């Protein structure tokens, strides 16, 4: 398991999860399993935020697309949430102070090579 880097980084998650629980589409401690399931009866472009299963990441974005349900790791490094970077990514990954602000940004961006479709959240 990875412990927090600094006091700032901890207080960051407190506010990240607070604003996440208030958001309504935050599904706590849900694995990648229900993600491929709950987003099956949802249109392509429906998404949710869940707790990552990996010890390296706090949260993870799951989104239903045409190819199927795809999941996205959300790294927190130095107090900024960003999506995981691709080697073929020419443009740098956007950083954000709030985890919610990361979502709104993505609502062109592609995913290995279908586009990134963020439309509707999944209420909890």
């Amino acid at each position: 398991l990875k412990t927090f880097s600094s006091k700032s980084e901890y207080q960051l998650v407190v506010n990240a999860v607070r604003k996440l629980q208030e958001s309504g589409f935050y599904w706590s401690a849900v694995t990648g399993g229900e993600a491929n399931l709950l987003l099956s009866a949802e249109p392509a472009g429906t998404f949710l935020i869940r707790d990552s299963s990996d010890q390296r990441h706090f949260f993870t974005l799951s989104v239903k697309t045409q190819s199927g349900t795809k999941n996205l790791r959300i790294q927190c490094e130095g107090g900024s949430f960003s999506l995981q970077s691709d080697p073929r990514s020419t443009q740098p990954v956007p950083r954000f102070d709030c985890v919610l602000k990361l979502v709104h940004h993505y609502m062109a961006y592609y995913i290995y090579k279908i586009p990134l479709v963020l439309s509707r959240p999944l209420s909890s």
Partner: peptide, 8 residues
Amino acid sequence: VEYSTVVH
């Protein structure tokens, strides 16, 4: 699980 990365 099905994970992917975002290309810009």
